[PDB]
Point group: D2
């Protein structure tokens, strides 16, 4: 593909899963993609697979790493067109009493402040290229989830911050958007399902958790990101739902039994 | 003892004869208002009159412009003012897949569920401006997030919620607020009768209760309390959609990012 | 050129403005496009301009026109992959007192029931192809607009109906989504501004209603439609905002503290 | 009072502005109100003025203060029915380049993590009383604001956290809701306008950002909070907008046609 040929993209948390789907979609559209991740195993494997991808061992919670990430991207490739902030962690299920303020702070560092720091340091270069920012949030930021108070809070912050940044950078023509995935299949999901008491039933339940009757794929998140970067020139501050309809009344009305 | 939160005020409730509408009537009567019930449901409207001296029933079809004109005329002639219009008239058809619906049926449903609200609101606005009154439209959560087997109904309630916001903008210079309430699953005597005919009534009742995080269905009185709030204490709210759903729209019942 | 190659797309109201931008975007993606519109000249002209595109003189409020649109599309191509319901009309500004029930009914016919009728007739073929429906709504269905009660109501209905249809047709793998444009610069926008007391000032207000400081283009709505048809395979029941950020932040909502 | 008579309410950030409006609303409804606020806040004066209000010198970012707040409330009054989390700060206008990660962390401590800590410590008692939580968020969490990246992020977090908490506490019958005010006229608003070169013009812009043509009052936020506590028994996880319609319609979002 050539929809993003000659462009340079940074993807944080790009080493596997959703992030790697985003990396792959951008490489397939002709872009040069810099993977910033602490997941060296996955980032190196993706670099091995995809000639247009470059892996940098990089922790978005460390300001020095982010500074080096940006300066190396510009040194090596001369420009920066798109930042995709996918770094972030979903803790295991935890009731409010099973969480701590210290853990909440740690999760805000990774899921929110890493996005903040990279976006801030990238903006001078994005202004030069009339580039754009894509934040990967979550449907649970919009409608909540049980047993995930810290995670939900961090993703509500990301979606709101996207809108604030969109307003602040609109005079420069720099768009800032987010994608909110629902249930996305990954190899990790498949491995965990195989250890359930009834894998067939657990898999079917996951597929039926949204109206489309299957889980999403990383490539589908990736295609949404390439759209936002390359063709959505009048979109800024939007939340693009990639959920298979999970937020719909599927929540089905019981106004009659 | 009659309450005083809306004492001396005059309220019109369309579709007020039973169910959600009657809960709204009762809430306003108990807040001290004179409430005019506009409905074709004479049985329910007359029963409410017998229970509630503060309510008055008028046989009234909001799809008939002459009926709406008579409704407003008579309300002003008898009671001298109009402070709040609650547009609750509306029908939910039985479940129908798209291929089981007709354009003619859809048009009929728009007449009852949307254009009746439009006609009454238009005719009431001169009087609402005089009283610095307000409009409350009863929509539905399904207008916001959809439901299966209800394309016409969902469309009509999406229209009501949007029209609420347009009207709020148009009437804001006059200080007339326009808001809507979107109920979720509300218990009624009809609901309880229908559940008894299900293959497993106990399971159907439990399913209905568990369809929202709060673990019960809502009550008409709760929709009524929300309407009294919007009329009497929400003076900086206009164009809002007040959800009365027990959390049904929330990520309940839920992420499967892990199996 | 190949993102949607070989796929059959129907666009109602495709003769000008937003609709023509959608038609052009789908032709550029390799699709075969059937244009349904009432403008003979503009429709024939697009057909002449875009090889492989087909124009049918077609009024979606007429059930016989809709039946012919579907039947002749299937007769021509044997398949139907995407229906884009863009037909619709925006009236001039009208205060509530200046609207009528009859005018409201006729706007519901144009803006809502045409979409309903075509979608119903198309769904059997869309199920066969695992195709999709794209409804063109408006931002004002979501946030309201002044002096537009009937229009706003029709677009709130379209957006809600999209979600209902998505729920009904997801068992068949048929996605149903909508695009909500904000201010898109078109001859229609220009014609509406010409009715204003100061057209230049109205156009400038329209541009400054977006944080981006410009209005959108038909081509941008068209690109969003091609995305929804060809690459948004896990999206159903969504409202894709193409608004330039008009819904964001505070702005001037009243004319000349608590 | 009597809408919330015999109940016990904690209001963080209750000393002035919106918070003081909430305190007064609950005292007027018959509740005993415990103010958690700092030394210079106004809370001590509210205790002087209002026999129904109690002031506790209390910084929600300090876990020991929050523990003392809850333990003293229970020791004195034996129950806790409602927690209103209004503590929070709006920084002056700041472009992204004028913000720091350290400042952002500090703002998350005050605006988000204080609400988290108090809610967690209050929940055993709210379960006993079938009480409720009200978080004061902001419209800008939903639609953004210019020159406020950290503030907007914190309020987006509060609104989302409200929904997560609603899901976690619905099994116990504990409702968790938020109020999102828009422009409310307060000393804080006036102080921010005074930073501007033309304060009168900034105030007029602030008034005209609402279709109603005015800003809101602390009392109007307070009335919304009393509704959520006392009458919104089928509402959980909602965002109650108290904004005067600021989110509705088109308005001026850029400064001096499709490129």
């Amino acid at each position: 593909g050539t929809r993003y040929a000659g462009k340079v993209v940074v993807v944080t948390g790009g080493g596997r899963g959703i992030g790697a789907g985003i990396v792959r979609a951008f490489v397939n559209s002709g872009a040069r993609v810099v993977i910033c991740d602490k997941d060296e195993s996955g980032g190196r494997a993706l670099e091995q697979e995809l000639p247009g991808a470059v892996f940098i061992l990089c922790d978005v919670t460390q300001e020095d790493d982010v500074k080096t990430l940006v300066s190396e991207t510009i040194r090596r490739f001369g420009r920066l067109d798109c930042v995709v902030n996918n770094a972030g962690h979903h803790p295991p299920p935890q009731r409010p009493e099973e969480t701590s303020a210290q853990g909440f702070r740690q999760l805000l560092e990774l899921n929110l402040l890493g996005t903040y720091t990279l976006t801030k340091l990238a903006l001078p270069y994005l202004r030069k290229s009339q580039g754009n920012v894509i934040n990967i949030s979550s449907l649970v930021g919009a409608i909540g989830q049980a047993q995930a108070v810290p995670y939900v809070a961090t993703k509500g912050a990301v979606t709101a911050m996207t809108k604030a940044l969109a307003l602040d950078e609109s005079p420069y023509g720099v768009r800032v958007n987010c994608i909110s995935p629902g249930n996305i299949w990954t190899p990790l999901w498949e491995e965990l399902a195989a250890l359930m008491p009834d894998p067939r039933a657990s898999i079917r339940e996951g597929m039926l958790a949204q109206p489309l009757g299957r889980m999403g794929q990383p490539a589908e998140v990736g295609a949404a990101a390439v759209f936002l970067a390359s063709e959505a020139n009048f979109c800024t501050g939007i939340e693009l739902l990639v959920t298979g309809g999970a937020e719909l009344g599927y929540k089905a009305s019981r106004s009659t039994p």
